[PDB]
Amino acid sequence: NTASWFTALTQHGKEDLKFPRGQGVPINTNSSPDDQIGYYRRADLSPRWYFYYLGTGPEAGLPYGANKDGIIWVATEGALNTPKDHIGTRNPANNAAIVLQLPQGTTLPKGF
RNA sequence: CACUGAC
RNA sequence: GUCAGUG
C-alpha cells in the first residue's frame, strides 16, 4: 500500500497548490463525512501533488495544520480529526487510482 | 543508493 | 530498459 488513492493534481504554473478552508478533499463515494480530511504532498517537468487521508501516507505522523514545506491541509466541514486507518493507502498491484474529482464551486489555483 | 508497481 | 510511486 505505497500510493495515494487518487491521480495527481499537476502544477503547470509558479503557484503552489492551496485550497480555501472547506475545499480540496477529493470525492470518494466509499468514504463518509467523518473521513473528508487530509493533505496534498508534492511527489513533463510539472510538479505533481497527491492527496492522502489524515493519519496515512508519507506524513501519517503529522497532525492536521502542522506546517511543513510541500504539504497542504484540506478538510470538508463536519470531518473528524482522527487517523483514517480503515481507508489507508492504495496497493497499485491490487487497485487502480481513483480519478481525482473536486465538486462544482471548488476554487483551483492558477496553473492547476 | 534502495524497494515496489506498470509497460 | 522506460515511466511512475515510495523509503
UniProtKB/Swiss-Prot annotation:
<comment type="function">
    <text>May block host chemokine function in vivo, facilitating viral replication and transmission. Acts by being secreted into the extracellular space where it competes to host chemokines for binding to host glycosaminoglycans (GAG).</text>
</comment>
<protein>
    <recommendedName>
        <fullName>Nucleoprotein</fullName>
    </recommendedName>
</protein>
<feature type="binding site">
    <location>
        <position position="90"/>
    </location>
    <ligand>
        <name>RNA</name>
    </ligand>
</feature>
<comment type="subunit">
    <text>Homodimer, homotetramer, homooligomer with RNA. Both monomeric and oligomeric forms interact with RNA. Interacts with protein M. Interacts with protein E. Interacts with NSP3; this interaction serves to tether the genome to the newly translated replicase-transcriptase complex at a very early stage of infection. Interacts with host NLRP3 and ABHD8; these interactions disrupt the association between NLRP3 and ABHD8, increasing NLRP3 stability, ultimately leading to increased inflammasome activation.</text>
</comment>
<feature type="binding site">
    <location>
        <position position="48"/>
    </location>
    <ligand>
        <name>RNA</name>
    </ligand>
</feature>
<comment type="similarity">
    <text>Belongs to the betacoronavirus nucleocapsid protein family.</text>
</comment>
<feature type="region of interest" description="RNA-binding">
    <location>
        <begin position="1"/>
        <end position="112"/>
    </location>
</feature>
<feature type="domain" description="CoV N NTD">
    <location>
        <begin position="1"/>
        <end position="112"/>
    </location>
</feature>
<comment type="function">
    <text>Packages the positive strand viral genome RNA into a helical ribonucleocapsid (RNP) and plays a fundamental role during virion assembly through its interactions with the viral genome and membrane protein M. Plays an important role in enhancing the efficiency of subgenomic viral RNA transcription as well as viral replication. Attenuates the stress granules formation by reducing host G3BP1 access to host mRNAs under stress conditions.</text>
</comment>
<feature type="region of interest" description="Disordered">
    <location>
        <begin position="16"/>
        <end position="36"/>
    </location>
</feature>
